[PDB]
Paper text:
[name] is one of the principal polyproteins of [name]-1 and its constituent domains are (from N-terminus to C-terminus): matrix (MA), capsid (CA), spacer peptide 1 (SP1), nucleocapsid (NC), spacer peptide 2 (SP2), and p6. In the mature virion, the CA forms the genome protecting protein shell, which contains ~216 CA hexamers and 12 pentamers in a fullerene type arrangement. The CA protein monomer is divided into an N-terminal domain (NTD) and a C-terminal domain (CTD), connected by a flexible linker. A highly conserved sequence in the CA protein, the major homology region (MHR), plays a critical role in assembly, maturation, and infectivity.
Numbering used by the authors:
A (entry chain R), B (entry chain S), C (entry chain Q), D (entry chain P), E (entry chain O), F (entry chain N): 1 to 221
């Protein structure tokens, strides 16, 4: 990791044992559940591509998903190469060179160049660029490892609205979808896939009713 | 979070693994229980909107409450905009741009922006403004996910007074009701819904008796 | 709390995740057991009233004890308020005000006021004042939830004197009773409530024996 | 280990209890599963050769595997002495001695030579050379201690492709096979050792298919 | 406790949670066992009298000993007052008041006074003095609470010399005897009080043999 | 212990809780195992004799070993005094006193003296010296509490070769014998003490076969 102290004093730190353990245990316990993404992202704030590779490589099992993640990363490295030409210019001997895809993915750069890119002026955020590429592949993994389709999420006849809504927003959370489309699934599907009895109730509230009002309206139906 | 050092030197740091796990296990273990709000608020001291959002996004499950909270937050951000019109013409180069409700909520603002208002003299403490909106949305949730009103809490045949007075001020603690109404519930219901045996003993003290007189009188029944 | 660093800089620090966990486990493992009150005093070393209410409020359940505690704090506050003369008109900017009972209890004051009082020499130690009120209320509660009278503790037919002494000064520690009454209990009851055999041993030493002499005599019975 | 602090400041410190313990417990619990080698690299960031011997000598249990690794360490050591002969006379003015194989392996050399080599400019990275020699012998242990070869990974009749693919990308992970060769093993063996139903669907995709296209095709199978 | 930084700055810091918690755990796991007195002393590095009292009060149960310990501390406090009485007239303007036993016992002395004595020119280490007084009483607990004497350990017909010697030196640790008396007990009781089969062997090695030599001798009897 | 900071500022530090807990746990799990001995050095890197006395004295039980160790140290101590006699006539004015053997074992030397010798230039390493005596004595203990002869380690009629090479080198590790003789045990005894079926397997490879070759050859017999 690299920890910035007062005055922007940037110092690399080797990775902590209790980070290593927390992150590995999270993936053993909860698998590819959506909270893994914010947890991953948090626990790798200021990480180098080597520290990020550590976190993935210290995981055993789930090797079908990690093989997909490698490929996804290899695709984002071919796309960084496509977008940023490979030509070495009249750059100074002591100044940082220009990162490649494989520099970003942590394979052709050294730790000192990765610390260098991050700390240097101008900086290149090779650690966070790589995080976006991992997180994308994780979006593919979460989406792939979902057991449920969001359209089949429906209120039962004897199902409290509130337990259905937990089901609706779990299965929705685990979709990759535009926000606009997710807005549409809330405003169309929630009232639409309800039970007749509760369906009536949410309609009487009209279109400016809140989920709070909606849960409290269906408290005893 | 942002650690205030000596000479008033404020340096940001990312949120700890053991804060993340203590907050995560709290929600798993204790659900929407009243002490969860001071516990959340306490583990979130010195938090930015990004750190508060981290803590909420690392909560896996309970998504009907997180959606109810999203709508609540949006209502407090939008309400902030209601109070404050858009600031016309050019922004001054010595001055920070004044936050909109969506900058406070952490979404049309960067992390660096959040740190910018909060640290820049005279500080705008957007973390502690937004935090109060979160603690607002949580109270609504704590109060909703409560199964019992005070009328529904009574002492059974052989139940010790002590466990009942605990049940009573736990359910009162979690109610929506005002202090004049929560006084009325205390002075009426508490002795009224005691069992025959304990009710007889509390009647023999008089009505002017204290909770201390009430606890040491009715203990062995 | 407020951590004093070098050359007497007292600077506030948030209550640590492990402070919180420690108080949660202490209350979990040992409830309303005597030595828990020292754990609290220790965990509240250099604490503010916000940090005292945070610790009390972070307690799961036990609202009969906490409602009793509120009643005691509110009584201690009304008594402080009673004794201190009322301020004539507003407080001029150079006048650091003198706290009312509710200022001490953290309900009418700001954190900056609580810090202000403590650091502005001759210090008004509002944390340490409020802690005595809380500790005082914890002793009443503790004494009141204490199961067994000191009078009723007695030796088994061939029970070891040492184990009987452990029970006697364990129960004695939870007794309301005066130091002078407890000195009588030492001189009268300790031999008195022993069993026929050990009683005889103990009687033969006369009253000049210390507890080591009582212990070494009853080393074999 | 040796901690690089602000501005090339290298400072010696002891190997951490909870480091040491983390390594003993990974080996106690999990032996020589593929994830153990990345864990060992994760836990030894900035370790000297001495610190690296500390970690091998603190293993109890499994001394045939540890023996295999010493022999490997002597092989890797002898090869370093073959490639670079002894350097005659007394050491060059203000220059560090070129280490032997036994110096990299931490036996003929002293900890102060090891700290000089690592911290000097140009640095001699003795810690990372020996660490490769250890990682090579841990791979011989991993591979030997494995019961299944990648030729032997095959799908059940009613088995999910995904769980099988997890056994395959785990087994592929422990292969000493080169990357051009691992690529043949992916495009050939995965479908070939598939069940007849999932095999048919995957053959229909053509030879252009990704792992994702293969997993989403055999989702219903 | 009081933490010394560079330039001889001694600044008090509040008692650590995990120090507190570890102490508590020691008394529960090992009771008042011999090895506890060096662990306690170890855990009470830089302790004030108030931190020493905090450790004693943070224990519950085992109160016959806690009573022995109280009385012993009072005796020693009474001894310091006898050895060091009050000197004529009021206190110096710039210096501290000379300590009483009750000030060393931390009961009549404020924390500030206690900081005062350790930091003062000339300093009285009232912590380290009080701790020795505590340790005298702890040794009285160890010696009283040992179940058996060094005289009472002799070797059975199927007992291994090794286990016999384990028992001998265990029991010795807890006795009152001096090193020249303890020396006599090694050279006299151990072989004397051994079983016939090991005794012939040990006599044969002759009285200049070590315990390692005696232990190897008696290894297959 | 003594922590060497940047630019070589050596300041003594209090004996860390997880130093104390780590050594306690280590002894509880691994007793007289050979692995205790590197762990002992690693956990004592940077120690004083006071601190080494703390770890040894905080060991409960094992009092046969503590007497054997004690004896080994007094022997090493007696000898250090024989070889290093104190200088003729009057003392150098500024200098520190001569460490005697008991000083080095921390018996007769205070904390300050031990800190002087270690930090003084040229340093007298009382800590590292005491550790070799402690390690010498620990190696005797380990070896004593090991019982099996290496001649007695043989393969069962259908025992896995690995479980026998593990037993063989576990017992070999605790043998006293020179390295060339341990090389002789490797070449003679290993293949010799194997069962008819595995013996046959190894005999077919020819006698030049490496342990990697012996282990893959007997992978399944």
């Amino acid at each position: 990791p690299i920890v910035q102290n007062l005055q922007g004093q940037m110092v690399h730190q080797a990775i902590s044992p209790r980070t290593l353990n927390a992150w590995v245990k999270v993936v053993e316990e909860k698998a590819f559940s959506p909270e893994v993404i914010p947890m991953f992202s948090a626990l790798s704030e200021g990480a180098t591509p080597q520290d990020l590779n550590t976190m993935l490589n210290t995981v055993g099992g789930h090797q079908a998903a990690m093989q997909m993640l490698k490929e996804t990363i290899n695709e984002e490295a071919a796309e960084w190469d496509r977008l940023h030409p490979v030509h070495a210019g009249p750059i100074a001997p002591g100044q940082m060179r220009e990162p490649r895809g494989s520099d970003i993915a942590g394979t052709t750069s050294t730790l000192q160049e990765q610390i260098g890119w991050m700390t240097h002026n101008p900086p290149i955020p090779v650690g966070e660029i790589y995080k976006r590429w991992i997180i994308l592949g994780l979006n593919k993994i979460v989406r792939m490892y979902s057991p449920t389709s969001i359209l089949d999420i429906r209120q039962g006849p004897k199902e409290p609205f509130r337990d259905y809504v937990d089901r609706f927003y779990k299965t929705l959370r685990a979709e990759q979808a535009s926000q606009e489309v997710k807005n549409w699934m809330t405003e169309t599907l929630l009232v639409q896939n309800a039970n007749p009895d509760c369906k009536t109730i949410l309609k009487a509230l009209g279109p400016g009713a809140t989920l709070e009002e909606m849960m409290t309206a269906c408290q005893g139906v």
